Ligand binder design. Structure first.
Ligand SMILES: Nc1ncnc2c1ncn2[C@@H]1O[C@H](COP(=O)(O)OP(=O)(O)O)[C@@H](O)[C@H]1O
Ligand SMILES: Nc1ncnc2c1ncn2[C@@H]1O[C@H](COP(=O)(O)OP(=O)(O)O)[C@@H](O)[C@H]1O
Ligand SMILES: [Mg+2]
Ligand SMILES: [Mg+2]
Lengths: 554, 552
């Protein structure tokens, strides 16, 4: 039964009620209708010295374009725990608007494991991405006005790294020339747009602890350089105050719920292939005051999202994840064993056997961070009973804790086996969380650490552009920043072609960006683009709404 | 006395809503002090009586503005202070100008709508809905070119621009689709400011979500190589566009500082677009109130004519009175006093500049709705100067009232409120439009230019000629006209002050808004994306652990 059919038929508690059931007081809630709200940052502030609940991360194997089921699983696990009577919350990322009209669709879950109101969540929600987009683009506009008004600071406009942003898959704005028409109309220069969720401004939102912090980070954002190579910042242009203003509400996290009325925060939405892939620190640390157990997702596979959750988010938050759930699927493991994407509804026992190496490696990789894993087998409607025991069997045989999850088709009661297993590991195998690398290393050493330890490459190559940039950033004193790698989600390699556990290969960084405001560095690898495109048949064509109800949203 | 420093005073909008006879389950809250009202309110009240409709317009402005909004709000509070059941309908301010020059559009002093900062920034996200529907269409157009261009669109004739609600001059003329075969198809475009979007115009003229969707579908984005038009319908975008507008379509309820209810819905500018708030908000408010005050942008040559010939025409409104805001400082400017000298007294310059207001007074008379001048008093106004004007007005002889609504709130608008009631009770209106749709495009341009602006005639650049021919050829000859033209003069020349004579308008570009249902001749040098000044107000804007430091 279609995801929007059942999302629209849902039966929701007023969120003011859920809020109150969490120790949040009426005047700390700001409603966006009965079913959505924003929680004050005073909640976390007044509880600063109270103990945390347990932190549970969900990550996954290397996906197909439709995705496996982190979100779908995160929601379900949360519903299952609520059904064992636990005081639990999910933290998730706000879905990017753009992909609802292209390809992979929304990010509110699936079947009976969803967050709702789904169509709000997937579209405009509470206006957060819009606030990111306007602060980002206001800065750009100010940069461009500056050039026009005599270029007082002597910016070399051919070095401006600050791009524009919009929350759509618009490939035609990747590379553009701007400022044309003559002397009344700006200064010609080459730029383009990224998708808003990849904005550094969203990164700042996701790492900041409150408005004034966000304002200070904004002011350290570097937009470009003078003709003599001195950096020029958003604070040099006095933009941070306006930028902060535009984020005045977006800083607060959003409360919705699951289909079974369990509470859920949704806040910040960076992708994990081209950004840091986590929800806001603010959401997650607030939730940890409010619930005994907090489930949260990192984007794409564990080589990307899980790695950056540990090495960036946890680092900057002081978080100590207690357990980690790895989502695996028969569909995907078969793909990693040879089966084409068009033949996956077919049984193939060997292609799951030789596809397993993929998961083998993700488990290995999680183990390196010292937090105990449980595998979740997200049973797809087509997966045969035989394929399903083999995977169970392979996970046990590898030593790993496992559980089948029928959360998609059955909701929270599809996730009891799994929920017990997570509870089992919280109670019986404590976590020993530590980062992969220290901050005092070179940029190139940190990159090589991730390259070799996680993706399993032999080493890393640099274009001259990249080398020039790394020099620049260490010499300017940003050498201590952590690394958010941009790379394809479809492989451990930077070649989207290398399925499974590719061996004897090299990653090539072509471009290096600096996020001095969010406080990390972004080495861009392979051919990954920072603005995605629409397909031949965009979801949009099938999308509609009548005197009430909507179709084509997924 | 700072605008933003009146961040004090309000009551829950839900109380305000029930007090207009709106049901609880028709109110959607965005905090305790903003809401969206269902379209079911108007529907169920369809057969009930309309209140009195009052338009507030103005003389030709100083860049700072002459106080329409400030006056519309004041008037509303003043009527309430006379025990009247009254509402204001306003436009949502464009976000861009709060960081630019002119600021937000929530009023002034003690005549403002609140919560101001929300109202002027993201508000309830309508402008963002507009922006994304428009730009998703743009994105689908470009994707289509990229995926074999099956419809054979000549990318060099695409009229559909992109949009963003900032003053960004550098996005006026751009080249996109660069980088090779994987990254699109190169083409010249740019951006307009979001409030000037056709999508906004449609929102502002439509009656519900399914009307809006069908309008979207009729939007022409460009042409095939053999000149066949291609629509948003042909690309199947209207459903998604409408989805993104599902809440934007419902109007918003806020209030005034003295707690009078207010609708804010739709933002289009009057120089570049059609300059009125939504029909939805206006027609709804007529059911809930005995008196509905509403503003049209810039001077009467722009917003008034458009409110009358476009909004009123499509809505079936008959306006009952019209208020013309005038100021001493502006009249002086028009009498030759430089911008920098408008604080200093100068009676003779005020006598000379009167001509401007005189023509606006005449022009309102041609639509057949009676008029009341509001003289909106600034702190620099001499007692002598305010008397000269009042005398000038009654000798004209229009009804006049001094207004101290800015400094005093509704108490300051009693004499004005009285005169307006006095006009509605004795001098009923005989509204009629300036022109008929049967005319040709060029004839309608020429009525408006001749009768309202005072031009001797109109010239067309070759490009404008082509376009007008193309639209007549295609069946759109019968559309009404929404002139784009500078607010600073009756002419298309921003330096021709007072009441210029013996001038000609030149239209250099003509757009077709097939979905909103009008045509836009662009005159003189006016741009559809504005720019940021030397020192933008953004540079002085800030927020601490609570308090905001600029709204202007
Ligand atoms: N077990 C399942 N069977 C069928 N569809 C599923 C299942 N789990 C998830 N989905 C659907 O597949 C897509 C991917 O799920 P999602 O939770 O979004 O994965 P991820 O979070 O890793 O991107 C969504 O459309 C979801 O509704
Ligand atoms: N009587 C007055 N004294 C001082 N400032 C005023 C007065 N009336 C309006 N203003 C201010 O001047 C600017 C323009 O007023 P506004 O109501 O926006 O006119 P318009 O709607 O025609 O632009 C605003 O900053 C407003 O607060
Ligand atoms: Mg997901
Ligand atoms: Mg105004």
């Amino acid at each position: 039964p279609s995801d929007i059919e059942i999302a629209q038929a849902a039966k929701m508690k007023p969120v003011m009620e859920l809020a109150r059931g969490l120790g949040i007081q009426e005047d700390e809630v700001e409603l966006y209708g009965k079913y959505k709200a924003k929680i004050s940052l005073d909640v976390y502030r007044r509880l600063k010295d109270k103990p945390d609940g347990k932190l549970i991360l969900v990550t996954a194997i290397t996906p197909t374009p439709a995705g496996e089921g982190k979100t779908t699983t995160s929601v379900g696990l949360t519903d299952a725990l609520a059904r064992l009577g636990k005081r639990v919350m999910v933290c998730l990322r706000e879905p990017s608007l753009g992909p609802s009209f292209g390809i992979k669709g929304g990010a509110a879950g699936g079947g009976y494991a969803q967050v709702v109101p789904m169509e709000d969540i997937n579209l405009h929600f509470t206006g957060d991405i819009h606030a990111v987009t306007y602060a980002h683009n206001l800065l750009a506009a100010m940069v461009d006005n500056h050039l026009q008004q005599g270029n007082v600071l002597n910016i070399d406009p051919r070095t401006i790294t600050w791009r524009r942003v919009i929350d759509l898959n618009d490939r035609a704005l990747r590379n553009i020339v701007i400022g044309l028409g003559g002397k009344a109309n700006g200064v010609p220069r080459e730029t383009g747009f990224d998708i808003s969720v990849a904005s550094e401004v969203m990164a700042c939102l996701c790492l900041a602890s409150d408005l004034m912090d966000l304002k200070e980070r904004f002011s350290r954002i570097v937009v470009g350089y003078t003709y003599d190579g001195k950096p020029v910042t958003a604070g040099d242009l006095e933009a941070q105050g306006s930028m902060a203003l535009l984020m005045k509400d977006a800083i607060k996290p959003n409360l919705v719920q699951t289909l079974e009325n369990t509470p859920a925060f949704i806040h910040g939405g960076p992708f994990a292939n081209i950004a840091h892939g986590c929800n806001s620190i603010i959401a997650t640390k607030t939730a940890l005051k409010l619930a005994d157990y907090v489930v949260t997702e990192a984007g794409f596979g564990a080589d990307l999202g899980a790695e950056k959750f540990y090495d960036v988010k946890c680092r900057y938050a002081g978080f100590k994840p207690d357990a980690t759930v790895i989502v695996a699927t028969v569909r995907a493991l078969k793909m990693h064993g040879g089966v084409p994407k068009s033949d996956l509804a077919t049984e193939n026992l060997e292609a799951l056997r030789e596809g397993f190496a993929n998961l083998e490696k993700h488990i290995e990789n999680i183990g390196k961070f010292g937090v105990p894993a449980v595998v979740a087998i997200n049973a797809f409607p087509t997966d045969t009973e035989a394929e399903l025991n083999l995977l169970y069997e392979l996970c046990a045989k590898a030593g790993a804790e496992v559980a089948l999850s029928e959360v998609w088709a059955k909701g929270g009661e599809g996730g009891l086996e799994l929920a017990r297993k997570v509870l089992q590991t919280l109670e019986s195998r404590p976590s020993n969380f530590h980062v992969l690398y220290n901050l005092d290393l070179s940029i190139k050493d940190k990159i090589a650490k991730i390259a070799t330890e996680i993706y399993g490459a032999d080493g890393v190559n640099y274009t001259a552009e990249a080398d020039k940039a790394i020099q620049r950033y260490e010499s300017l004193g940003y050498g201590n920043l952590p690394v958010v790698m941009a790379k394809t989600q479809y492989s451990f390699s930077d070649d989207m072609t290398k399925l499974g556990r590719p061996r004897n290969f090299t990653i090539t960084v072509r471009e290096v960006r600096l996020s001095a405001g969010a406080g990390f560095i972004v080495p861009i690898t392979g051919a990954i683009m920072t603005m995605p495109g629409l397909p031949k048949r965009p979801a949009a064509c099938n999308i509609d709404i009548d005197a009430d109800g909507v179709i084509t949203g997924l």
